[PDB]
Write a protein that holds these residues in place. Structure first.
Motif, PDB file in Angstrom:
ATOM      1  N   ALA A 136       0.886  -1.113  -0.083  1.00 52.86           N
ATOM      2  CA  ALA A 136      -0.002   0.150  -0.004  1.00 52.86           C
ATOM      3  C   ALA A 136       0.633   1.121   0.052  1.00 52.86           C
ATOM      4  CB  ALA A 136      -1.004   0.016   1.226  1.00 52.86           C
ATOM      5  N   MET A 137       0.227   2.252  -0.443  1.00 52.70           N
ATOM      6  CA  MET A 137       0.806   3.590  -0.537  1.00 52.70           C
ATOM      7  C   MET A 137      -0.047   4.500   0.279  1.00 52.70           C
ATOM      8  SD  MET A 137       4.068   3.490  -1.583  1.00 52.70           S
ATOM      9  CE  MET A 137       5.071   4.520  -2.682  1.00 52.70           C
ATOM     10  N   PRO A 138       0.162   4.813   1.410  1.00 52.60           N
ATOM     11  CA  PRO A 138      -0.897   5.409   2.377  1.00 52.60           C
ATOM     12  C   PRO A 138      -0.202   7.040   2.729  1.00 52.60           C
ATOM     13  CG  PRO A 138       0.011   3.699   3.909  1.00 52.60           C
ATOM     14  CD  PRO A 138       0.584   3.435   2.511  1.00 52.60           C
ATOM     15  N   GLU A 139       0.188   7.501   1.733  1.00 52.44           N
ATOM     16  CA  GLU A 139       0.440   8.856   1.824  1.00 52.44           C
ATOM     17  C   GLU A 139      -0.420   9.912   2.051  1.00 52.44           C
ATOM     18  OE1 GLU A 139       2.021   6.906  -0.498  1.00 52.44           O
ATOM     19  OE2 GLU A 139       3.308   5.948   0.901  1.00 52.44           O
ATOM     20  N   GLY A 149      10.136   7.050  -5.548  1.00 50.93           N
ATOM     21  CA  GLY A 149      10.082   6.812  -7.159  1.00 50.93           C
ATOM     22  C   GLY A 149       8.886   5.890  -7.381  1.00 50.93           C
ATOM     23  N   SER A 150       8.011   6.080  -6.691  1.00 51.61           N
ATOM     24  CA  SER A 150       6.709   5.360  -6.933  1.00 51.61           C
ATOM     25  C   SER A 150       5.883   5.996  -8.093  1.00 51.61           C
ATOM     26  CB  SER A 150       5.579   5.021  -5.830  1.00 51.61           C
ATOM     27  OG  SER A 150       5.153   6.276  -5.284  1.00 51.61           O
ATOM     28  N   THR A 151       6.034   7.090  -8.510  1.00 49.33           N
ATOM     29  CA  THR A 151       5.736   8.034  -9.605  1.00 49.33           C
ATOM     30  C   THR A 151       6.363   7.591 -10.946  1.00 49.33           C
ATOM     31  OG1 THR A 151       6.669   9.811  -8.968  1.00 49.33           O
ATOM     32  CG2 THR A 151       4.501   9.714  -8.364  1.00 49.33           C
ATOM     33  N   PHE A 152       7.426   6.945 -10.976  1.00 50.38           N
ATOM     34  CA  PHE A 152       8.033   6.316 -12.074  1.00 50.38           C
ATOM     35  C   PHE A 152       7.970   4.977 -12.362  1.00 50.38           C
ATOM     36  CE2 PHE A 152      11.767   6.561 -15.015  1.00 50.38           C
ATOM     37  CZ  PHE A 152      12.187   5.250 -14.940  1.00 50.38           C
ATOM     38  N   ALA A 153       7.625   4.052 -11.202  1.00 51.67           N
ATOM     39  CA  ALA A 153       7.740   2.689 -11.256  1.00 51.67           C
ATOM     40  C   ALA A 153       6.170   2.383 -11.410  1.00 51.67           C
ATOM     41  CB  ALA A 153       8.097   2.095  -9.903  1.00 51.67           C
ATOM     42  N   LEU A 154       5.283   2.617 -10.626  1.00 51.86           N
ATOM     43  CA  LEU A 154       3.797   2.236 -10.830  1.00 51.86           C
ATOM     44  C   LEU A 154       3.274   2.439 -12.281  1.00 51.86           C
ATOM     45  CD1 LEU A 154       2.016   2.659  -7.479  1.00 51.86           C
ATOM     46  CD2 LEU A 154       3.637   0.737  -8.079  1.00 51.86           C
ATOM     47  N   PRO A 155       3.513   3.556 -12.794  1.00 54.11           N
ATOM     48  CA  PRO A 155       2.860   3.772 -14.207  1.00 54.11           C
ATOM     49  C   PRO A 155       3.750   2.921 -15.226  1.00 54.11           C
ATOM     50  CG  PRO A 155       3.260   5.997 -13.083  1.00 54.11           C
ATOM     51  CD  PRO A 155       4.111   4.685 -12.104  1.00 54.11           C
ATOM     52  N   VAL A 158       2.612  -1.692 -13.672  1.00 52.40           N
ATOM     53  CA  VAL A 158       1.141  -2.160 -13.278  1.00 52.40           C
ATOM     54  C   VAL A 158       0.938  -2.927 -14.560  1.00 52.40           C
ATOM     55  CG1 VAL A 158      -0.881  -1.655 -12.894  1.00 52.40           C
ATOM     56  CG2 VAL A 158       0.684  -0.533 -11.682  1.00 52.40           C
ATOM     57  N   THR A 159      -0.139  -4.000 -14.442  1.00 51.42           N
ATOM     58  CA  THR A 159      -0.522  -4.899 -15.573  1.00 51.42           C
ATOM     59  C   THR A 159      -1.774  -4.723 -16.181  1.00 51.42           C
ATOM     60  OG1 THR A 159      -1.316  -6.335 -14.074  1.00 51.42           O
ATOM     61  CG2 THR A 159       1.250  -6.653 -14.707  1.00 51.42           C
ATOM     62  N   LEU A 160      -2.627  -4.234 -15.306  1.00 53.27           N
ATOM     63  CA  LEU A 160      -4.071  -3.987 -15.627  1.00 53.27           C
ATOM     64  C   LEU A 160      -4.579  -2.586 -15.465  1.00 53.27           C
ATOM     65  CD1 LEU A 160      -5.855  -7.394 -14.424  1.00 53.27           C
ATOM     66  CD2 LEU A 160      -4.794  -6.902 -16.633  1.00 53.27           C
ATOM     67  N   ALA A 161      -5.275  -2.233 -16.401  1.00 54.57           N
ATOM     68  CA  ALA A 161      -6.023  -0.933 -16.256  1.00 54.57           C
ATOM     69  C   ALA A 161      -4.952   0.258 -16.094  1.00 54.57           C
ATOM     70  CB  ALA A 161      -7.127  -0.939 -15.484  1.00 54.57           C
ATOM     71  N   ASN A 162      -3.646   0.146 -16.836  1.00 58.14           N
ATOM     72  CA  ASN A 162      -2.878   1.014 -16.473  1.00 58.14           C
ATOM     73  C   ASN A 162      -2.179   1.611 -17.981  1.00 58.14           C
ATOM     74  OD1 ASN A 162      -1.074   2.197 -14.492  1.00 58.14           O
ATOM     75  ND2 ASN A 162       0.664   1.526 -15.762  1.00 58.14           N
ATOM     76  N   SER A 163      -3.016   1.615 -18.964  1.00 60.76           N
ATOM     77  CA  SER A 163      -2.915   2.118 -20.124  1.00 60.76           C
ATOM     78  C   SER A 163      -2.390   3.649 -19.959  1.00 60.76           C
ATOM     79  CB  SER A 163      -3.899   1.955 -21.196  1.00 60.76           C
ATOM     80  OG  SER A 163      -4.194   0.844 -21.477  1.00 60.76           O
ATOM     81  N   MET A 167      -4.705   3.022 -13.217  1.00 63.86           N
ATOM     82  CA  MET A 167      -4.737   2.050 -12.049  1.00 63.86           C
ATOM     83  C   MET A 167      -3.371   2.653 -11.019  1.00 63.86           C
ATOM     84  SD  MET A 167      -5.790  -0.949 -10.611  1.00 63.86           S
ATOM     85  CE  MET A 167      -5.271  -1.392  -9.055  1.00 63.86           C
ATOM     86  N   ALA A 168      -2.228   3.066 -11.511  1.00 65.67           N
ATOM     87  CA  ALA A 168      -1.174   3.617 -10.729  1.00 65.67           C
ATOM     88  C   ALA A 168      -1.689   4.877  -9.957  1.00 65.67           C
ATOM     89  CB  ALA A 168       0.048   4.146 -11.690  1.00 65.67           C
ATOM     90  N   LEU A 169      -2.667   5.810 -10.605  1.00 64.04           N
ATOM     91  CA  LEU A 169      -3.216   6.796 -10.081  1.00 64.04           C
ATOM     92  C   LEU A 169      -4.321   6.405  -8.835  1.00 64.04           C
ATOM     93  CD1 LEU A 169      -3.820   9.256 -12.777  1.00 64.04           C
ATOM     94  CD2 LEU A 169      -2.524   9.681 -11.022  1.00 64.04           C
ATOM     95  N   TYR A 170      -4.819   5.217  -9.197  1.00 61.80           N
ATOM     96  CA  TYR A 170      -5.784   4.694  -8.243  1.00 61.80           C
ATOM     97  C   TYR A 170      -5.261   4.297  -6.847  1.00 61.80           C
ATOM     98  CZ  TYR A 170      -9.098   1.241  -6.027  1.00 61.80           C
ATOM     99  OH  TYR A 170      -9.864   0.551  -5.264  1.00 61.80           O
TER     100      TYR A 170
END
Lengths: 217, 53
Positions: A136-139, A149-155, A158-163, A167-170
Protein backbone atom coordinates in the motif's frame (compact mmCIF):
# COMPACT_ATOMS: atom_id res chain seq x y z
CA UNK A 1 25.89 -2.34 22.47
CA UNK A 2 22.40 -1.84 21.06
CA UNK A 3 21.26 -4.10 18.24
CA UNK A 4 22.30 -2.55 14.91
CA UNK A 5 19.33 -1.16 12.98
CA UNK A 6 20.30 -3.10 9.82
CA UNK A 7 22.20 -6.40 9.91
CA UNK A 8 24.52 -7.52 7.11
CA UNK A 9 25.43 -11.18 6.64
CA UNK A 10 27.08 -13.44 4.06
CA UNK A 11 25.16 -16.22 2.29
CA UNK A 12 27.87 -17.97 0.23
CA UNK A 13 28.26 -15.54 -2.72
CA UNK A 14 25.05 -13.70 -1.76
CA UNK A 15 25.05 -10.78 0.69
CA UNK A 16 21.95 -10.62 2.90
CA UNK A 17 20.72 -7.23 4.15
CA UNK A 18 18.17 -7.59 6.96
CA UNK A 19 16.10 -4.73 8.39
CA UNK A 20 16.32 -4.99 12.19
CA UNK A 21 13.80 -2.53 13.69
CA UNK A 22 10.99 -4.93 14.69
CA UNK A 23 9.33 -2.58 17.20
CA UNK A 24 8.95 0.06 14.46
CA UNK A 25 7.89 -2.45 11.78
CA UNK A 26 11.31 -1.93 10.16
CA UNK A 27 10.70 1.78 9.57
CA UNK A 28 13.53 3.42 7.62
CA UNK A 29 15.43 6.27 9.28
CA UNK A 30 18.46 8.18 8.03
CA UNK A 31 20.79 5.79 9.86
CA UNK A 32 19.36 2.68 8.18
CA UNK A 33 19.32 4.31 4.74
CA UNK A 34 22.89 5.59 5.04
CA UNK A 35 24.20 2.22 6.22
CA UNK A 36 22.51 0.35 3.36
CA UNK A 37 23.58 2.93 0.79
CA UNK A 38 27.24 2.73 1.82
CA UNK A 39 27.36 -1.06 2.10
CA UNK A 40 25.76 -1.50 -1.33
CA UNK A 41 28.48 0.62 -2.95
CA UNK A 42 31.10 -1.71 -1.47
CA UNK A 43 29.23 -4.81 -2.66
CA UNK A 44 29.10 -3.27 -6.14
CA UNK A 45 32.91 -3.04 -6.19
CA UNK A 46 33.37 -6.55 -4.77
CA UNK A 47 34.08 -9.40 -7.19
CA UNK A 48 33.01 -12.12 -4.72
CA UNK A 49 29.38 -10.94 -4.32
CA UNK A 50 27.01 -12.13 -7.05
CA UNK A 51 23.67 -10.86 -5.74
CA UNK A 52 22.10 -9.10 -2.76
CA UNK A 53 19.02 -10.14 -0.78
CA UNK A 54 17.02 -7.46 1.05
CA UNK A 55 14.82 -9.05 3.73
CA UNK A 56 13.49 -8.36 7.22
CA UNK A 57 14.07 -10.11 10.54
CA UNK A 58 10.42 -9.55 11.55
CA UNK A 59 8.72 -11.63 8.84
CA UNK A 60 5.85 -12.38 8.49
CA UNK A 61 4.81 -9.40 10.62
CA UNK A 62 6.36 -6.77 8.35
CA UNK A 63 9.10 -6.14 5.80
CA UNK A 64 9.03 -2.33 5.98
CA UNK A 65 6.04 -0.31 7.20
CA UNK A 66 7.45 2.81 5.54
CA UNK A 67 10.01 5.57 5.97
CA UNK A 68 10.18 7.13 9.44
CA UNK A 69 8.10 10.22 8.71
CA UNK A 70 6.91 10.70 12.30
CA UNK A 71 10.46 11.75 13.17
CA UNK A 72 10.53 14.05 10.14
CA UNK A 73 7.35 15.69 11.45
CA UNK A 74 8.99 16.50 14.79
CA UNK A 75 11.88 18.04 12.86
CA UNK A 76 9.46 20.33 11.03
CA UNK A 77 7.81 21.32 14.31
CA UNK A 78 11.30 22.10 15.66
CA UNK A 79 12.45 23.82 12.43
CA UNK A 80 15.16 21.15 12.08
CA UNK A 81 14.73 21.30 8.32
CA UNK A 82 18.35 20.28 7.72
CA UNK A 83 17.66 17.02 9.56
CA UNK A 84 14.53 16.42 7.47
CA UNK A 85 16.32 17.06 4.17
CA UNK A 86 19.04 14.62 5.27
CA UNK A 87 16.41 11.94 5.86
CA UNK A 88 15.03 12.32 2.33
CA UNK A 89 18.40 12.68 0.59
CA UNK A 90 19.50 9.39 2.15
CA UNK A 91 16.29 7.48 1.43
CA UNK A 92 15.83 8.75 -2.13
CA UNK A 93 19.52 8.23 -2.88
CA UNK A 94 19.18 4.62 -1.70
CA UNK A 95 16.11 4.15 -3.90
CA UNK A 96 18.11 5.47 -6.86
CA UNK A 97 21.00 3.12 -6.08
CA UNK A 98 18.70 0.08 -5.97
CA UNK A 99 17.02 1.07 -9.24
CA UNK A 100 20.33 1.38 -11.11
CA UNK A 101 22.17 -1.43 -9.30
CA UNK A 102 24.02 -3.62 -11.79
CA UNK A 103 23.87 -6.82 -9.71
CA UNK A 104 20.62 -8.72 -9.02
CA UNK A 105 18.80 -7.56 -5.89
CA UNK A 106 16.09 -9.87 -4.52
CA UNK A 107 13.65 -8.35 -2.03
CA UNK A 108 11.55 -10.65 0.18
CA UNK A 109 8.31 -8.69 0.72
CA UNK A 110 7.20 -11.05 3.49
CA UNK A 111 4.85 -8.73 5.35
CA UNK A 112 3.63 -5.15 5.30
CA UNK A 113 5.45 -3.39 2.45
CA UNK A 114 4.08 0.16 2.63
CA UNK A 115 5.76 3.44 1.74
CA UNK A 116 9.53 3.23 2.03
CA UNK A 117 9.14 -0.53 1.85
CA UNK A 118 7.70 -0.13 -1.64
CA UNK A 119 10.79 1.87 -2.58
CA UNK A 120 12.97 -1.03 -1.41
CA UNK A 121 11.19 -3.50 -3.73
CA UNK A 122 9.48 -1.57 -6.54
CA UNK A 123 12.88 -0.72 -8.06
CA UNK A 124 14.15 -4.32 -8.15
CA UNK A 125 13.25 -6.69 -11.02
CA UNK A 126 13.12 -9.51 -8.42
CA UNK A 127 10.49 -8.41 -5.89
CA UNK A 128 9.03 -11.57 -4.34
CA UNK A 129 5.63 -11.52 -2.65
CA UNK A 130 4.05 -13.99 -0.23
CA UNK A 131 0.64 -14.71 1.28
CA UNK A 132 1.56 -12.20 4.01
CA UNK A 133 2.38 -9.36 1.59
CA UNK A 134 0.40 -6.13 2.12
CA UNK A 135 1.39 -3.51 -0.46
CA UNK A 136 0.00 0.00 0.00
CA UNK A 137 0.97 3.66 -0.45
CA UNK A 138 -0.88 5.42 2.42
CA UNK A 139 0.62 8.88 1.91
CA UNK A 140 -2.54 10.80 0.97
CA UNK A 141 -3.86 10.33 4.52
CA UNK A 142 -0.67 11.79 6.07
CA UNK A 143 -0.49 14.82 3.77
CA UNK A 144 2.57 13.67 1.82
CA UNK A 145 3.06 12.58 -1.80
CA UNK A 146 3.87 9.23 -3.45
CA UNK A 147 7.62 9.17 -2.88
CA UNK A 148 10.47 6.64 -3.35
CA UNK A 149 10.10 6.81 -7.12
CA UNK A 150 6.63 5.28 -7.04
CA UNK A 151 5.52 7.86 -9.62
CA UNK A 152 8.13 6.45 -12.02
CA UNK A 153 7.62 2.74 -11.22
CA UNK A 154 3.87 2.15 -10.83
CA UNK A 155 2.98 3.85 -14.16
CA UNK A 156 5.47 1.51 -15.87
CA UNK A 157 4.99 -1.87 -14.15
CA UNK A 158 1.28 -2.24 -13.36
CA UNK A 159 -0.34 -4.88 -15.56
CA UNK A 160 -4.10 -4.15 -15.70
CA UNK A 161 -5.99 -0.92 -16.41
CA UNK A 162 -2.72 1.03 -16.59
CA UNK A 163 -2.68 2.18 -20.22
CA UNK A 164 -2.71 5.84 -19.10
CA UNK A 165 -1.54 5.30 -15.50
CA UNK A 166 -5.17 4.88 -14.41
CA UNK A 167 -4.43 2.01 -12.03
CA UNK A 168 -1.24 3.69 -10.81
CA UNK A 169 -3.29 6.77 -9.93
CA UNK A 170 -5.89 4.58 -8.22
CA UNK A 171 -3.35 3.03 -5.84
CA UNK A 172 -1.48 6.27 -5.13
CA UNK A 173 -4.56 8.47 -4.63
CA UNK A 174 -6.76 6.01 -2.70
CA UNK A 175 -4.11 4.23 -0.63
CA UNK A 176 -5.71 0.84 -1.26
CA UNK A 177 -3.94 -2.12 0.34
CA UNK A 178 -3.18 -5.04 -1.99
CA UNK A 179 -2.57 -8.47 -0.46
CA UNK A 180 -0.37 -11.33 -1.65
CA UNK A 181 -1.52 -12.95 -4.88
CA UNK A 182 -3.29 -9.75 -5.94
CA UNK A 183 -0.01 -7.82 -5.73
CA UNK A 184 1.63 -10.41 -7.99
CA UNK A 185 -1.19 -10.27 -10.54
CA UNK A 186 -1.17 -6.45 -10.64
CA UNK A 187 2.58 -6.32 -11.30
CA UNK A 188 3.51 -5.05 -7.84
CA UNK A 189 5.40 -8.32 -7.24
CA UNK A 190 7.54 -10.06 -9.85
CA UNK A 191 7.19 -13.48 -8.19
CA UNK A 192 4.87 -15.21 -5.72
CA UNK A 193 6.62 -17.61 -3.32
CA UNK A 194 5.20 -19.15 -0.16
CA UNK A 195 6.79 -17.77 3.00
CA UNK A 196 7.72 -21.30 4.08
CA UNK A 197 9.89 -21.59 0.94
CA UNK A 198 11.92 -18.43 1.56
CA UNK A 199 14.62 -20.18 3.60
CA UNK A 200 15.24 -22.71 0.82
CA UNK A 201 15.19 -19.96 -1.82
CA UNK A 202 17.76 -17.88 0.08
CA UNK A 203 20.13 -20.85 0.23
CA UNK A 204 19.75 -21.51 -3.50
CA UNK A 205 20.41 -17.85 -4.32
CA UNK A 206 23.69 -17.97 -2.41
CA UNK A 207 24.78 -21.13 -4.23
CA UNK A 208 24.22 -19.99 -7.82
CA UNK A 209 27.12 -18.23 -9.54
CA UNK A 210 27.76 -16.86 -13.04
CA UNK A 211 29.17 -19.59 -15.32
CA UNK A 212 32.47 -19.59 -17.20
CA UNK A 213 33.59 -15.99 -17.97
CA UNK A 214 30.33 -14.14 -17.24
CA UNK A 215 30.15 -11.53 -14.50
CA UNK A 216 27.15 -11.30 -12.14
CA UNK A 217 26.14 -8.08 -13.95
CA UNK B 1 94.57 14.40 25.56
CA UNK B 2 92.47 17.41 26.61
CA UNK B 3 90.70 17.34 23.25
CA UNK B 4 90.15 13.58 23.63
CA UNK B 5 88.52 13.86 27.06
CA UNK B 6 86.31 16.80 26.10
CA UNK B 7 85.27 15.32 22.75
CA UNK B 8 84.37 12.02 24.43
CA UNK B 9 82.23 13.71 27.09
CA UNK B 10 80.48 15.76 24.40
CA UNK B 11 79.88 12.65 22.30
CA UNK B 12 78.36 10.82 25.28
CA UNK B 13 76.06 13.73 26.14
CA UNK B 14 75.15 14.27 22.48
CA UNK B 15 74.37 10.56 22.16
CA UNK B 16 71.95 10.61 25.10
CA UNK B 17 70.11 13.60 23.62
CA UNK B 18 69.92 11.97 20.18
CA UNK B 19 68.50 8.77 21.65
CA UNK B 20 65.90 10.69 23.66
CA UNK B 21 64.81 12.62 20.57
CA UNK B 22 64.79 9.49 18.43
CA UNK B 23 62.71 7.52 20.93
CA UNK B 24 60.11 10.28 21.22
CA UNK B 25 59.87 10.46 17.42
CA UNK B 26 59.42 6.69 17.16
CA UNK B 27 56.76 6.88 19.87
CA UNK B 28 54.87 9.61 18.02
CA UNK B 29 55.16 7.74 14.72
CA UNK B 30 53.81 4.57 16.33
CA UNK B 31 50.79 6.47 17.64
CA UNK B 32 50.15 7.95 14.20
CA UNK B 33 50.57 4.58 12.48
CA UNK B 34 48.24 2.95 15.01
CA UNK B 35 45.68 5.72 14.55
CA UNK B 36 45.67 5.10 10.80
CA UNK B 37 45.16 1.39 11.45
CA UNK B 38 42.21 2.16 13.74
CA UNK B 39 40.72 4.57 11.19
CA UNK B 40 37.51 3.16 9.73
CA UNK B 41 37.52 2.66 5.96
CA UNK B 42 34.63 2.03 3.60
CA UNK B 43 35.83 -1.54 2.98
CA UNK B 44 35.17 -2.28 6.67
CA UNK B 45 31.45 -2.35 5.85
CA UNK B 46 31.98 -5.67 4.05
CA UNK B 47 33.50 -7.32 7.15
CA UNK B 48 30.78 -9.16 9.06
CA UNK B 49 30.45 -8.12 12.70
CA UNK B 50 28.55 -9.16 15.84
CA UNK B 51 29.44 -6.15 17.97
CA UNK B 52 26.48 -6.50 20.35
CA UNK B 53 27.16 -10.14 21.21
Amino acid sequence: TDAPPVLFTVQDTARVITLNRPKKLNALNAEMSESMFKTLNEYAKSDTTNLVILKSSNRPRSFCAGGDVATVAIFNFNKEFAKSIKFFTDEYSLNFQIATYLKPIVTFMDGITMGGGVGLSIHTPFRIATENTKWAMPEMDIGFFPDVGSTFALPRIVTLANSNSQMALYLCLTGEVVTGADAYMLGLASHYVSSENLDALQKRLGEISPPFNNDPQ
Amino acid sequence: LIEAFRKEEARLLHKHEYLQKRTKELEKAKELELEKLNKEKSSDLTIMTLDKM
